[PDB]
Each structure stands twice: as C-alpha cells, then as structure tokens.
Amino acid sequence: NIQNMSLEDIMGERFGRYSKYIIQDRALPDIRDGLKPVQRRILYSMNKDSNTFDKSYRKSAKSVGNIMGNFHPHGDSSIYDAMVRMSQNWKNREILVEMHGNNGSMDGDPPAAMRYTEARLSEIAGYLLQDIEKKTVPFAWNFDDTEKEPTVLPAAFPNLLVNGSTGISAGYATDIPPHNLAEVIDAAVYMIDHPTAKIDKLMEFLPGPDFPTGAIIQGRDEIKKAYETGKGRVVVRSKTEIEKLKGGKEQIVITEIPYEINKANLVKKIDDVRVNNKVAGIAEVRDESDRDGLRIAIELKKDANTELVLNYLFKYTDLQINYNFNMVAIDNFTPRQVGIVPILSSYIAHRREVILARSRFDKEKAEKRLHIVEGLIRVISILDEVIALIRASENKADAKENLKVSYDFTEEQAEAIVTLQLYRLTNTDVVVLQEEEAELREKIAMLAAIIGDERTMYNLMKKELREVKKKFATPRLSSLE
C-alpha cells in the first residue's frame, strides 16, 4: 500500500481532468441549444417530471431534489440559483422558468430559498425540448447508470443567440448578449436559403443585440467586428429624459439602465457623486421605481447645468457602461470563438439532424402500423379459419407459430393478431382499415421526401422557424445609434 508519482505528473493530469470538465460540462454553452449542462438538466428534468407551464406550479425544492438525485451530481445551491436565473426577465430575454415568490430583482436583492418558491418551466422552453421524445437527439447515461439524459436539446429556436451566456471556465471565458428572437430567426432563415451569407447582409436582419433592460447601444462599427471575429466593444447608455419642475428647477429621469447593472448600487453611486460633490448639478437623487416600471429621478438645484451633469455621470458612473463580446461556445466537444455565422450555421445543421432524425423516427412508427394493418386486413378475409386455429393451438407462442407457418403472416403480424381482445371481433370492416392504411402511406411518402430531398427538408426547417417567430416574437427593447 504505497504508490509513487511525481509532482509534475500529478498536476498535469489532475488539472487536465478539472480543466476539461469545467470547459465542457460546467461553464460553457453548447453552440447549438445554447445551454449549459445544469440548465439543460433542469429543463429536461422539470419537463420529464411533467412540470410544464400549462400545469400547476411546483415547490422548487422538489424540482431540485429530483435534478440533483437523478441528473446533476452537484450542489443544490448551484442547481437552484441557475434555476432562479432562468426565471429572471431582466437577465434573460426569453425567460425559461416561471417562479412564484421572491426570485430577486434588479435592486440586487437575494432570491428566496428553494424552500419558499414554486416553479414550472415556461412555455417557450417546451420549444427547446420539442420532439425530444422522438429520438431526435443523442442520449447518455446518468451517473447512476439508471436513466438516460439528453446531451443536447432539439432546440426549436436559436437560444444561444437569443438568451446569450456568461461565462467563466478554465482557459476560456464566454460572454454573449441577448438578441431578439424574431430578428435572429430572420437571419437563421436567410442563411438556410443563401448558405454562403456574408456578414454585412446578415447584419441587415440581425443588427446588434437586444438587452432585456433595453437602453441605447452604439457601436455599429464594433458590432460588425464582434459578429465577425467574436470579440467586440460596444457602448451602452441608459435612457434619459428631461422633466421640468415648478421653481426654475430641472429633473433628469432615467427609465432604462445597461444590461447586468445593479440599479440599487447604481443609484447609491449617483447620490455619492452628489455628496462627495464631484459635479455641479448635484441636488437630490431619488429612485422611484415600483412594480411595473423603472424610474430614476435625479433632480437639480438652480444653476441647471443639466447637459454638463448628465454627460459627467455618463463617464463617471455606470449609467453608461461598455459591453464585451467574447463569443465562446462548445462546438465538436471543444471551445471555439465564434461570430454570428458559425453560431448560426451550427444551429441550422443541428436542426437538420434533428429534423431528419425525427422524420426517420416518425416513418418507422408508421411503416410498423402499416405492416400490422395490412395483416389485420388479410386476417378479416379468413377470420373464421384463424380463430379456429388459435383455439386449436396450445399456448400463445404456438398460435403465433401456426399463423406464421400456415398463413405466412409475420412475427409482428402474428403478435398483433393474437393479442386482439374479443370485442375487437365486434367490428370486421375491411373499409375503415383501408382508410388508415391510406393515411399511413401518404405519411410515409411525405416523410421519405423530407429525409432524402435536402431542399424540402430545409423548407420544413424554415416553416417551423417562422411559426416559432410569430408565436414568440416581441418588439425591440434596445435602440441602435
């Protein structure tokens, strides 16, 4: 009982392990469904556990215990917090979890414990999971080796671009900003038709992001470079209005702040500019925001240096921030830095494989029912003989053999026949059967088209994408200058 290993050979391997798992399976998004494993396990579990948006909300602690015991071998705090985030309209552009209770706020406060809250998945999240039950996607075993897990979701829209991601692993980081579902789908779609799409044209549809907190974004020149290379610096400015106050007084009102900034603290920093008297127009600073509205009123004194003051704040507080594009996702099991183009194409190809796989699944299911139906049809023409023969036999398997040797049915045909209950004998109508057969055969033709006819396939892809667009679209919140 003793081993010798060098310090050199230990560190390399250990760090190797950690870096790997942290790079792939913890911190980085899949470029396809734009999910990190915790998120995906959350969606997948809540969904499997019929915790859909259309049914009653359910006790967060239950959701997590289930995720933790079945899929995600880590801390409940990690699972829960990540759950909570997905419930946050300000952080995500299309929230994927609905949570009842205190799930935090912009003023930065602490979400209530999983023991107080209740959650279900959202509506749009079902879309990511769409078709998962039709063998559309690669499954793995859970750590228990007791249950299987999707490595990726069917992703009925481009969540990666829409919701974004951040973003700290080993050797890489990732920051990706939210984007307008509608806009992104329009880009996606174009690229489907014209694959060799140049960035400039794609920019026409998808031009700059869309932060859930809205606000003003300037850096067209910069957004281009981001969408191109992957890295970019763009400028984000809260949205400003002027209000006039009875008494030769002027108020500066703010109704949108830059993505990912702490309204509670931002306010304190502004009042701090005033007390430490670092500018002239310092008067009163008031945060008057209630549910259903964000309003920050900074009122001035008499020498209304308004333009000077706002402009000062723009530099010296975070009322104006700078945002960074570091678009790093996992493609072919490895970290890649990427721009609108790869993040789009990878998506498309994914939907392709999904759609094909789905169709292959649907066709088989059909051809199997067709096969049984064809037999059911023959059986009717000899019903009397067949029944007598089942009676003659000695066991279930024996009858199945006799049907097969005698009348040349198949296995699957014999089995369906023999399990027929008695009341089914009540209706022996060649006609109704033949109608179903007809439908099955049109279904199969159609499927077989999407499978071996790339153009029609890409067509279906676009149809679905558009459908998702109409259902879920909403107007921009961020403005571009």
Binding site: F53, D54, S56, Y57, H100, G101, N102, S105, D109, P110, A112, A113, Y116, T117, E118, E123, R286, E288, D290, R291, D292
Partner: protein
C-alpha cells in the same frame, strides 16, 4: 435592518411587519415606497410576556421596532407611522407570530392599539385561474368567496390554496394585501382592558397549568 420610506409623514405612513426575510423581500419589491416601510421578523418573535426585561430590550427585532416607530415604551406617542400592519402567512405558525406581536404591543406600546393603529393584513387564501399567454386569475379570502369564484370561473379552472406569502410575487402581493384601495385589513381594537389582560396572560404566560385548562375547555379537538 429596516427598509424605510422615502418621505417622512406620520399622517399616512405604513410600517409592515413581515414574517421572514424572504417574504419581506417580496414586500419591498411591490409597494409604494413613497409612504410604506417593510420591516421583517427573522423567525419566531420574543415572548414579551414570558421573558425578563433584560432579554426583551436585547432582542434585535424588538429594539429595531422600538427605534423605528420612535415613541419609546414610558411610551409617549405621535412619531412615526399612522399604521402598523402585520403581514404573515395564513398558517398556524403565522397566527403564532400575530399572537407574539400583539402581546408585545399590548403590553408595552399599549396606546398604539387603543388609538387603533395596529392592523393585521389578510393575504388571500386562494387563487383561481382558468393556459399560458392567456391566463386568468382571481382571488378569494374565505369559504364562501371561493364558492362564488368557482361558479364564475366554472369547470376547468384550477384552484391554488396558498401555503404562504412566499408563494406569491410582488405584483400579486401589491394587488391583494398592500395596495390601499384593494387591500383588506383587520384593525385591532380592544373591547375592555381586564378581559384582555387575563386572556393575554393565560395564553402568552409563564404558567402552563392554566393554558392547559384553557386548551381543554376551549380548543375543540373534535
């Protein structure tokens, strides 16, 4: 620590005593901060009827309550809010904190109640909703109200039986139990003195043997 109100007005300023940090958070979120304060009670409140004076003054909740309202405990009066409103879960443990709070108020801040400044707030017991983007929810506070609601929403509509304040959002909290024009509050009066002092002492008291009888004679265990 207390979440204050932007303005100082003893004419119409509300002090909310909430059961638990988490619910208080939700409280701070939805609310008119122009004149209402959230002050949370981090778990089961000191029994100011079964605890020496040394302990009472040293208790974080109580002190914060005292210094936030102003008057003192003698007590003096108007500072500092013209409503002290108690917001707890509608459960047994919630009821227990109401017991503990009014005991304190009754014993020390006694004028406050007499002037009718102490209230208890009635969160809804039920939410009725009839899927997704088009969803409709209404609220009920009683046996009978739900009957009316169920008929209105008729078959197909699901009922939720709120287990606590944590189960509802800030907008929801506003609409039902905080917004002055929609809220339904209880107002504690006292309809004697001695009847009260006996009840408060038997129940909240250092005795037990009497509490037990009270429970035998009164708590109907069917």
């Amino acid at each position: 620590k207390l979440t204050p109100a932007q303005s100082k007005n003893p004419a119409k300023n509300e002090l909310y005593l909430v059961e638990g940090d988490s619910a208080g958070g939700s409280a701070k979120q939805g609310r008119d901060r122009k004149f209402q304060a959230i002050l949370p009670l981090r778990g089961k409140v000191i029994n100011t009827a079964k605890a020496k004076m040394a302990d009472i003054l040293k208790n974080e909740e109580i002190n914060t309550m005292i210094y936030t309202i102003g008057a003192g405990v003698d007590f003096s009066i108007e500072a500092n809010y013209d409503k002290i409103i108690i917001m707890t879960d509608a459960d047994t443990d919630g009821a227990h904190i109401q017991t503990l709070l009014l005991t304190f108020f009754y014993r020390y801040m006694r004028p406050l109640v007499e002037a009718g400044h102490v209230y208890i707030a009635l969160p809804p017991l039920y939410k009725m909703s009839k899927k997704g983007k088009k969803e409709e929810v209404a609220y009920a506070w009683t046996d009978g109200e739900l009957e009316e609601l169920r008929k209105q929403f008729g078959k197909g509509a699901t009922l939720q039986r709120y287990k606590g304040l944590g189960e509802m959002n800030a907008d929801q909290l506003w609409e039902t139990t905080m917004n002055p024009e929609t809220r339904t509050l209880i107002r504690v009066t006292i309809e004697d003195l001695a009847r009260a002092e006996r009840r408060v002492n038997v129940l909240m008291g250092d005795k037990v043997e009497p509490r037990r009888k009270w429970i035998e004679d009164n708590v109907k265990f069917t």
